[PDB]
């Protein structure tokens, strides 16, 4: 789809955790 | 600036990551 | 029947998923 | 060989979600 959303994540460590999951899910969707 | 912006493609993934973020925040709030 | 064993490769991913799992369990308890 | 770690996850929907995230992270790592 063409819809983008933003989430404000408190703290660098939590951001990197969620960023990694987000990127991984995006990559998996692209590869499916 | 204590919050970092996560850009997410798709509403389902947004809702998932929002739910996880909320759970992580609650876990932090309850940490000893 | 409600428990499943998640098989994970590597300590880093284990710690990430363990943290999320614990946080989801806590959110459930407070829902 | 790989070093496996295990987590006990309560609930099939939660298990399948965390399994999906786990698999996506594995894919992202494999893709470098």
Residue numbers in the entry:
A (entry chain A), D (entry chain B): 1 to 32
B (entry chain C): 2 to 33
C (entry chain D): 2 to 32
Question: What does the literature reporting this entry say, word for word?
Answer:
The p53 protein is a transcriptional regulatory factor and many of its functions require that it forms a tetrameric structure. The four domains include a central core DNA-binding domain, an N-terminal transcriptional activation domain, a tetramerization domain (TD) located just C-terminal to the DNA-binding domain, and a C-terminal regulatory domain that is controlled through numerous post-translational modifications. To generate the tetrameric form of p53, two monomers form an initial dimeric structure through interactions between their β-strands that results in a two-stranded β-sheet as well as hydrophobic packing between the helices from each monomer. Next, two dimers come together to form the tetramer, which is stabilized by a helical bundle that forms through a series of hydrophobic and electrostatic contacts between the side chains of the amino acids located in the four α-helices from each monomer.
